[PDB]
Coordinates of C-alpha atoms in Angstrom, one line a residue:
Chain A
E1 CA 104.2 114.7 89.1
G2 CA 102.8 114.3 92.4
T3 CA 100.0 111.8 91.7
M4 CA 103.1 110.0 89.6
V5 CA 105.0 110.1 92.8
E6 CA 102.2 108.1 95.0
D7 CA 101.4 105.8 92.0
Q8 CA 104.8 104.5 92.1
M9 CA 105.9 104.2 95.9
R10 CA 102.0 102.3 96.3
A11 CA 103.1 100.2 93.5
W12 CA 106.1 98.7 95.2
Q13 CA 104.6 98.7 98.4
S14 CA 102.2 96.2 97.0
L15 CA 104.8 94.3 95.7
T16 CA 106.7 93.9 99.0
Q17 CA 104.0 93.3 101.8
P18 CA 105.2 91.2 104.2
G19 CA 105.1 87.2 104.0
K20 CA 104.1 88.0 100.6
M21 CA 105.9 85.6 98.0
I22 CA 105.7 86.7 94.3
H23 CA 105.4 84.5 91.1
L24 CA 106.8 86.2 87.6
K25 CA 106.4 84.5 84.2
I26 CA 109.4 83.9 82.3
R27 CA 110.3 82.3 79.0
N28 CA 112.5 79.7 79.5
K29 CA 115.5 78.7 76.8
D30 CA 112.5 76.3 75.5
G31 CA 110.1 79.1 74.6
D32 CA 107.8 77.8 77.2
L33 CA 106.5 80.1 79.8
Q34 CA 107.6 79.1 83.4
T35 CA 106.6 80.3 87.0
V36 CA 109.1 81.5 89.3
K37 CA 108.8 82.6 92.9
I38 CA 110.5 85.9 94.1
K39 CA 111.1 86.9 98.0
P40 CA 111.5 91.1 96.8
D41 CA 113.0 93.7 98.8
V42 CA 112.6 97.4 97.7
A43 CA 114.1 100.4 99.2
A44 CA 112.4 103.1 97.3
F45 CA 113.6 106.8 97.1
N46 CA 112.5 110.3 95.3
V47 CA 114.9 113.4 95.1
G48 CA 113.8 115.6 92.3
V49 CA 116.7 117.5 90.6
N50 CA 115.0 119.9 88.6
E51 CA 115.1 123.8 88.9
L52 CA 111.4 123.7 90.3
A53 CA 112.8 121.2 92.9
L54 CA 116.1 123.0 94.1
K55 CA 116.1 126.6 93.1
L56 CA 112.6 127.4 94.3
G57 CA 111.8 124.2 96.0
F58 CA 108.5 121.9 95.6
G59 CA 108.0 118.7 97.4
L60 CA 111.0 118.6 99.7
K61 CA 108.8 117.7 102.3
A62 CA 106.6 115.0 100.6
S63 CA 109.6 113.4 99.1
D64 CA 111.6 113.3 102.8
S65 CA 108.7 111.1 104.1
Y66 CA 109.4 108.3 101.6
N67 CA 113.3 108.9 101.9
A68 CA 113.4 108.6 105.6
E69 CA 111.7 104.9 105.4
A70 CA 114.3 104.0 102.8
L71 CA 117.3 105.0 104.4
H72 CA 116.0 103.0 107.9
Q73 CA 115.8 100.2 105.4
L74 CA 119.3 100.4 103.9
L75 CA 121.6 101.5 106.9
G76 CA 119.8 101.0 110.2
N77 CA 117.8 102.8 112.6
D78 CA 120.7 104.9 113.4
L79 CA 122.0 107.9 110.8
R80 CA 124.3 109.5 112.7
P81 CA 127.6 109.7 110.6
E82 CA 129.6 108.7 113.0
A83 CA 127.9 105.5 114.0
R84 CA 128.4 101.8 112.4
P85 CA 126.0 100.8 109.4
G86 CA 123.6 98.5 110.0
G87 CA 120.6 97.6 107.7
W88 CA 121.4 96.2 104.2
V89 CA 124.8 97.7 104.5
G90 CA 125.4 96.0 107.8
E91 CA 124.9 92.8 106.4
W92 CA 127.0 93.0 103.8
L93 CA 129.8 94.4 106.0
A94 CA 129.3 91.4 108.1
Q95 CA 130.8 88.9 105.6
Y96 CA 134.4 90.5 106.2
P97 CA 135.0 91.6 102.2
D98 CA 137.5 93.0 100.4
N99 CA 135.1 96.1 99.7
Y100 CA 135.2 97.7 102.8
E101 CA 136.9 100.6 102.0
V102 CA 134.4 101.8 99.3
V103 CA 131.5 100.7 101.0
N104 CA 132.3 102.3 104.5
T105 CA 133.3 106.0 102.2
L106 CA 130.0 105.9 100.8
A107 CA 127.7 105.4 103.8
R108 CA 129.6 108.2 105.5
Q109 CA 129.1 110.6 103.0
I110 CA 125.6 109.6 102.6
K111 CA 125.0 110.0 106.0
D112 CA 126.3 113.5 106.1
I113 CA 124.5 114.6 102.7
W114 CA 121.2 113.7 104.7
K115 CA 122.1 115.5 107.7
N116 CA 122.5 119.1 106.4
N117 CA 119.7 118.4 104.2
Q118 CA 122.8 119.1 101.2
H119 CA 120.3 117.6 98.7
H120 CA 118.1 120.3 99.1
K121 CA 120.4 122.5 97.2
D122 CA 122.6 122.0 94.3
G123 CA 126.2 123.2 95.5
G124 CA 127.7 122.9 92.1
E125 CA 126.2 119.5 91.6
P126 CA 122.7 118.3 92.0
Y127 CA 122.9 114.6 91.5
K128 CA 124.9 114.5 95.0
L129 CA 122.3 111.8 96.4
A130 CA 121.1 110.0 93.6
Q131 CA 124.6 108.9 92.2
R132 CA 125.7 108.0 95.7
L133 CA 122.8 106.0 96.3
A134 CA 123.1 103.9 93.3
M135 CA 126.9 103.3 93.1
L136 CA 126.1 101.9 97.3
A137 CA 123.6 99.4 95.8
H138 CA 125.6 98.1 93.4
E139 CA 128.6 97.6 95.9
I140 CA 126.4 95.6 98.6
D141 CA 125.2 93.4 95.7
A142 CA 121.7 95.0 95.5
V143 CA 120.6 96.0 91.9
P144 CA 120.0 99.6 91.3
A145 CA 117.4 101.1 89.4
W146 CA 116.4 104.9 88.2
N147 CA 113.5 106.5 86.7
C148 CA 112.4 109.7 85.3
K149 CA 109.0 110.9 83.8
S150 CA 110.0 109.7 80.5
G151 CA 113.2 107.9 81.1
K152 CA 115.5 109.7 78.7
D153 CA 116.2 113.3 80.1
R154 CA 117.0 112.8 83.6
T155 CA 117.5 109.4 83.5
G156 CA 120.5 109.9 80.8
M157 CA 121.9 112.5 82.9
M158 CA 122.0 110.6 86.0
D159 CA 123.5 107.8 83.6
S160 CA 126.4 110.1 82.6
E161 CA 127.1 111.1 86.4
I162 CA 127.6 107.6 87.5
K163 CA 129.5 106.3 84.3
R164 CA 132.1 109.6 85.3
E165 CA 132.1 108.5 89.0
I166 CA 132.6 104.9 88.2
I167 CA 135.4 105.2 85.7
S168 CA 137.2 107.7 87.9
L169 CA 137.1 105.5 91.4
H170 CA 138.6 102.7 88.9
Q171 CA 141.9 104.4 88.9
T172 CA 142.6 103.2 92.4
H173 CA 141.6 106.8 93.5
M174 CA 139.2 107.8 96.1
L175 CA 135.9 108.9 96.1
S176 CA 135.2 112.9 95.5
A177 CA 133.5 115.2 98.2
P178 CA 130.1 115.6 98.2
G179 CA 129.0 119.0 96.3
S180 CA 132.2 119.8 94.7
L181 CA 133.0 120.6 91.1
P182 CA 135.5 118.0 89.0
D183 CA 138.9 119.2 88.5
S184 CA 140.5 119.1 85.1
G185 CA 141.1 115.6 85.0
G186 CA 137.3 115.0 85.8
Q187 CA 135.9 117.3 83.7
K188 CA 137.6 115.3 80.7
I189 CA 136.3 112.1 82.2
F190 CA 132.8 114.0 82.1
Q191 CA 133.4 115.5 78.7
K192 CA 134.2 112.2 77.2
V193 CA 131.3 110.3 78.6
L194 CA 128.7 112.7 78.0
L195 CA 128.9 112.0 74.3
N196 CA 130.6 108.4 73.9
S197 CA 128.0 107.1 76.3
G198 CA 124.8 105.8 74.6
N199 CA 122.1 108.8 75.9
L200 CA 122.2 110.3 72.2
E201 CA 121.3 107.1 70.5
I202 CA 118.5 106.3 72.9
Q203 CA 117.2 110.0 72.7
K204 CA 117.2 109.5 68.8
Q205 CA 115.4 106.0 69.3
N206 CA 113.1 107.1 71.6
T207 CA 112.0 110.6 69.9
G208 CA 113.7 111.3 66.3
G209 CA 116.3 113.9 67.2
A210 CA 119.2 113.8 69.8
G211 CA 119.4 115.9 73.0
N212 CA 118.4 116.7 76.3
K213 CA 115.9 118.7 78.1
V214 CA 118.0 119.2 81.2
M215 CA 119.8 121.6 79.6
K216 CA 117.9 124.6 79.2
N217 CA 119.5 128.0 80.5
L218 CA 116.6 130.1 82.1
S219 CA 116.5 134.1 81.8
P220 CA 116.7 135.0 85.0
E221 CA 120.5 133.5 86.1
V222 CA 119.7 132.5 89.1
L223 CA 117.4 129.4 88.3
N224 CA 120.4 127.8 86.6
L225 CA 121.4 124.3 87.5
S226 CA 125.1 125.2 86.7
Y227 CA 126.0 122.4 84.2
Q228 CA 128.5 125.2 82.4
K229 CA 130.5 124.5 85.4
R230 CA 130.9 120.6 85.7
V231 CA 131.2 120.7 81.9
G232 CA 133.6 123.1 81.4
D233 CA 133.0 123.5 77.7
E234 CA 130.7 125.4 75.7
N235 CA 130.7 123.6 72.7
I236 CA 130.1 120.3 74.5
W237 CA 127.3 121.6 76.3
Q238 CA 125.9 123.1 73.3
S239 CA 126.1 119.4 71.9
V240 CA 124.7 117.6 74.8
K241 CA 121.4 119.7 74.1
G242 CA 121.1 119.0 70.5
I243 CA 117.7 119.3 69.0
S244 CA 116.0 119.0 72.5
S245 CA 114.5 122.3 72.0
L246 CA 112.4 121.4 68.6
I247 CA 110.5 118.8 70.3
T248 CA 107.7 120.3 71.9
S249 CA 105.2 117.5 72.1
Chain B
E1 CA 92.1 92.5 141.9
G2 CA 95.0 95.1 142.0
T3 CA 97.3 92.7 144.1
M4 CA 95.7 90.0 141.9
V5 CA 97.7 91.3 139.1
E6 CA 101.0 92.0 140.4
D7 CA 101.1 88.1 142.0
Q8 CA 100.2 87.4 138.3
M9 CA 102.3 89.5 136.5
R10 CA 105.4 88.4 139.1
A11 CA 104.6 84.6 138.7
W12 CA 105.0 85.2 134.9
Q13 CA 108.6 87.2 135.1
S14 CA 109.8 84.4 137.5
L15 CA 109.5 81.4 135.3
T16 CA 110.6 83.5 132.1
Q17 CA 114.3 84.8 133.7
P18 CA 116.9 85.4 131.2
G19 CA 118.8 82.0 130.5
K20 CA 116.8 80.6 133.0
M21 CA 115.7 76.9 131.7
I22 CA 112.4 75.7 133.0
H23 CA 112.3 71.9 134.4
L24 CA 108.7 70.1 134.5
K25 CA 107.5 67.0 135.8
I26 CA 105.0 65.2 133.2
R27 CA 103.5 61.5 133.7
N28 CA 104.4 59.6 130.8
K29 CA 102.9 56.9 128.7
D30 CA 104.1 54.0 131.6
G31 CA 102.8 56.4 134.1
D32 CA 106.4 57.6 135.4
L33 CA 106.9 61.0 136.4
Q34 CA 109.6 62.5 133.8
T35 CA 111.8 65.6 134.0
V36 CA 111.5 67.8 130.6
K37 CA 113.2 70.9 129.7
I38 CA 111.4 74.2 128.2
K39 CA 112.6 77.7 127.4
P40 CA 109.6 79.4 127.9
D41 CA 108.8 83.1 126.4
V42 CA 105.5 84.5 127.8
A43 CA 103.8 88.0 126.5
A44 CA 101.7 88.7 129.6
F45 CA 98.6 91.3 128.9
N46 CA 95.6 92.7 131.1
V47 CA 92.7 94.7 129.5
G48 CA 90.0 94.9 131.7
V49 CA 86.5 94.6 130.2
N50 CA 84.1 95.6 133.4
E51 CA 82.1 98.4 133.8
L52 CA 84.7 99.8 136.5
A53 CA 87.0 99.9 133.9
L54 CA 85.1 101.0 131.0
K55 CA 82.3 103.6 131.8
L56 CA 84.5 105.0 135.0
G57 CA 87.8 103.5 134.5
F58 CA 90.0 102.0 137.3
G59 CA 93.5 100.8 136.6
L60 CA 93.8 102.0 132.9
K61 CA 97.2 103.4 133.6
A62 CA 98.4 100.3 135.8
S63 CA 97.6 98.0 133.2
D64 CA 99.1 99.9 130.0
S65 CA 102.4 99.6 131.7
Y66 CA 102.3 95.9 131.3
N67 CA 100.9 96.2 128.0
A68 CA 103.2 98.3 126.3
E69 CA 106.2 95.6 127.4
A70 CA 104.0 93.3 126.1
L71 CA 103.3 94.6 122.9
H72 CA 106.9 95.5 122.3
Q73 CA 107.5 91.6 122.3
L74 CA 105.2 90.7 120.3
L75 CA 105.1 93.2 117.6
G76 CA 108.4 95.1 117.9
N77 CA 109.6 98.7 118.8
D78 CA 107.7 100.3 116.1
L79 CA 104.3 100.8 116.8
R80 CA 103.2 102.7 114.2
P81 CA 100.1 101.3 111.9
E82 CA 101.7 101.6 109.0
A83 CA 105.3 100.2 109.3
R84 CA 105.8 96.3 109.2
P85 CA 105.6 94.1 112.0
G86 CA 108.4 93.2 113.6
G87 CA 108.8 90.8 116.9
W88 CA 107.5 87.2 117.1
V89 CA 104.9 88.6 114.4
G90 CA 108.0 89.5 112.1
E91 CA 109.7 86.2 112.6
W92 CA 106.9 84.2 111.7
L93 CA 106.2 86.3 108.8
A94 CA 109.9 86.0 107.4
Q95 CA 108.8 82.4 106.5
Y96 CA 106.7 83.2 104.1
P97 CA 103.5 81.0 105.2
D98 CA 100.6 81.2 103.3
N99 CA 98.8 82.6 106.0
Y100 CA 100.1 86.8 105.4
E101 CA 97.1 88.1 104.6
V102 CA 95.2 87.5 107.9
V103 CA 98.1 88.3 110.1
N104 CA 98.8 91.6 108.6
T105 CA 95.3 92.4 109.0
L106 CA 95.2 91.6 113.0
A107 CA 98.5 93.3 113.3
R108 CA 97.3 96.8 111.9
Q109 CA 93.9 96.6 113.6
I110 CA 95.7 95.8 116.9
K111 CA 98.0 98.8 116.3
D112 CA 95.2 100.8 115.2
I113 CA 93.1 100.3 118.6
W114 CA 96.4 101.2 120.6
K115 CA 96.8 104.0 118.8
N116 CA 93.7 105.9 119.6
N117 CA 93.1 104.2 122.9
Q118 CA 89.8 102.8 121.6
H119 CA 90.4 100.0 124.2
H120 CA 89.9 102.5 126.9
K121 CA 86.1 102.6 125.9
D122 CA 83.5 100.1 124.3
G123 CA 82.3 101.5 121.1
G124 CA 79.9 98.8 121.4
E125 CA 81.9 95.8 121.9
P126 CA 84.3 95.6 125.1
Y127 CA 86.4 92.7 124.0
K128 CA 87.7 94.6 120.9
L129 CA 91.6 94.4 122.0
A130 CA 91.4 90.9 123.8
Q131 CA 89.8 89.0 121.3
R132 CA 92.0 90.2 118.7
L133 CA 95.3 89.4 120.8
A134 CA 93.9 85.6 121.4
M135 CA 93.2 85.6 117.8
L136 CA 96.7 86.7 116.8
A137 CA 98.7 84.3 119.0
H138 CA 96.9 81.4 117.4
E139 CA 97.9 82.2 114.0
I140 CA 101.5 82.7 114.5
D141 CA 101.5 79.7 116.1
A142 CA 101.8 80.3 120.1
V143 CA 99.6 79.4 122.3
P144 CA 96.9 81.9 123.6
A145 CA 95.7 81.7 127.2
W146 CA 93.4 83.9 128.7
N147 CA 91.9 84.1 132.4
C148 CA 89.6 86.3 134.5
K149 CA 88.9 86.3 138.7
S150 CA 87.3 83.0 138.8
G151 CA 87.7 81.8 135.0
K152 CA 83.5 81.4 134.2
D153 CA 82.1 84.9 133.5
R154 CA 84.2 87.3 131.7
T155 CA 86.3 83.4 130.7
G156 CA 83.0 82.5 128.8
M157 CA 82.3 85.7 127.7
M158 CA 85.5 86.2 125.8
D159 CA 85.4 82.3 124.8
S160 CA 82.1 82.8 123.3
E161 CA 83.7 86.4 121.4
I162 CA 86.7 84.4 119.7
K163 CA 84.1 81.2 118.7
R164 CA 81.9 83.9 116.9
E165 CA 84.9 85.5 114.9
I166 CA 86.6 82.6 113.8
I167 CA 83.2 81.0 112.7
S168 CA 82.4 84.0 110.8
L169 CA 85.8 84.3 109.3
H170 CA 86.2 80.6 108.5
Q171 CA 83.7 81.6 105.7
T172 CA 86.3 82.9 103.5
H173 CA 85.6 86.2 104.8
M174 CA 87.8 89.5 106.1
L175 CA 87.7 90.7 109.4
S176 CA 85.5 93.3 110.7
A177 CA 86.2 96.7 111.9
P178 CA 87.5 97.3 115.6
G179 CA 84.2 98.6 117.4
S180 CA 81.5 98.0 115.6
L181 CA 78.3 96.1 116.0
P182 CA 77.5 92.7 114.4
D183 CA 75.4 92.7 111.3
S184 CA 72.3 90.4 110.6
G185 CA 74.3 87.2 110.1
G186 CA 77.0 87.9 112.7
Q187 CA 74.1 88.2 115.1
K188 CA 72.8 84.7 114.3
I189 CA 76.4 83.6 114.5
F190 CA 76.5 84.6 117.6
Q191 CA 73.1 83.8 119.5
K192 CA 74.1 80.3 117.9
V193 CA 77.0 80.4 119.9
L194 CA 76.1 81.8 123.0
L195 CA 74.0 78.7 123.7
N196 CA 75.9 76.1 121.8
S197 CA 79.2 76.6 123.5
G198 CA 80.2 74.7 126.2
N199 CA 79.9 77.6 128.5
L200 CA 77.0 76.7 130.5
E201 CA 77.5 73.3 131.6
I202 CA 81.1 74.7 133.0
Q203 CA 78.8 77.6 134.4
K204 CA 77.1 74.2 136.3
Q205 CA 80.0 72.3 136.9
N206 CA 81.9 75.2 138.7
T207 CA 78.7 76.3 140.8
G208 CA 75.4 74.6 140.7
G209 CA 73.4 76.6 138.4
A210 CA 74.0 78.1 135.2
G211 CA 74.5 81.8 134.2
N212 CA 76.8 84.4 133.7
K213 CA 77.7 87.3 135.8
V214 CA 78.4 89.5 133.0
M215 CA 75.0 90.2 132.6
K216 CA 74.1 93.1 134.7
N217 CA 71.6 95.8 133.7
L218 CA 72.2 98.6 136.3
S219 CA 70.1 101.1 137.1
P220 CA 71.9 104.4 135.6
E221 CA 71.6 103.2 132.2
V222 CA 74.8 104.7 131.3
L223 CA 76.8 102.1 133.3
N224 CA 75.9 99.0 131.1
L225 CA 77.8 97.5 128.5
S226 CA 75.6 97.1 125.5
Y227 CA 75.4 93.8 125.1
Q228 CA 71.7 93.8 124.2
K229 CA 72.7 95.4 121.0
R230 CA 75.3 92.9 120.4
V231 CA 73.1 90.0 121.1
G232 CA 69.7 90.9 119.5
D233 CA 67.5 89.1 121.2
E234 CA 66.1 89.7 124.2
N235 CA 65.1 86.1 125.2
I236 CA 68.7 85.0 124.3
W237 CA 70.1 87.4 126.7
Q238 CA 67.9 86.5 129.5
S239 CA 68.8 82.8 128.8
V240 CA 72.6 83.6 129.2
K241 CA 72.2 85.2 132.2
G242 CA 70.7 82.1 134.3
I243 CA 70.6 81.3 137.9
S244 CA 73.5 84.0 137.8
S245 CA 71.8 86.2 140.2
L246 CA 70.9 83.8 142.7
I247 CA 74.5 82.7 143.9
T248 CA 75.8 85.3 146.1
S249 CA 78.7 83.2 147.6

């Protein structure tokens, strides 16, 4: 998975070479290939949400070299939690949108996590940094994109995490604090999302059986990612992990 | 030559005082003096290409104080070779010109030379930094200007170096690596340039005899600037240095 990462980062760099304008082919409404011109701007991150990265800790140093550049691109050159946002966030806020409250909160939380290196552990919830990066990107009118090795297991879990937080926030609430377990109502939301999202059908379509490889229950108990607590239900947890253990392939 | 440098730097500073608009007198097409208004912006460098500066090393520390400010003005506040260009280069690239390839290469090479202090020695070619600064300035639509004590010996040599590289590049090539001797074809180009440029006539006009004082052949062999290798011809080397040794004045 190391060489996989440099291959991805190299690809993004080659498309965002400064002053280089990108040409894309698109089928128009008449079924004819047509060339369009794009000025891309990509902020590329890598976090790692496995036990291999959170319990015993692999590639933390390797990934943080990429993440530092991306944060400077996204928030500016000053990452103190009390400073004012810069970068893309600053440009969005300079328009004085009616969205300022949520944007300011998300930027502050991200700086907090980065400062204490809270993303190196799972203080009860391992997607703390990835989830907020995606939500912030949607707020400031960028496009969020995320990926895994195969695009169905860890990708599916992050999909569910984002949907849960968006739904919880939509009820005029605030955002939850980093590294905190969901409350009773949040747990009910999360349970409904995990089953009523489209992830199970994606799993079946892509493999032939429904399941998720993120749910493991390793033998030394200190190597588990603590989804038993986030999903406060044994049966639902066993339902998310479906035939996933029978797909050794 | 020290006080000469502070006099020049002081002059540039006095013309580029912030918020100060400059008034120039120009003879229009009717032969009448007319006043025009200029908003100047000058990046002033000093390098030193003598044996006094490259072999035994004089004023390296003094000049680098000026060069640091000028680079920040030209490339921005981040001079890491892998970062993205800022400053004037960044502003030019933000227009997405069809010139991006050459500009990116030149900026990268300049940062490399600055990082390793390669301009403090002559790894086979002493104009490595000056030549690239002038070429980069022309690419991003600035005006390049260079000077010597008298404006005919070291100025003439830098003139020839730039012309050789431009001609070599015009054949759709790439740029050569810093501190590398020219190949066979490059040597043929350089030999033709040194004689068919206008430098010899400038020498004769300004002095009465053709020659160049840069060609010395000092007695302790470790004090020579190694143009015997760059100009792979004894007769041509002896032809560039003409009556230059008979003009003690």
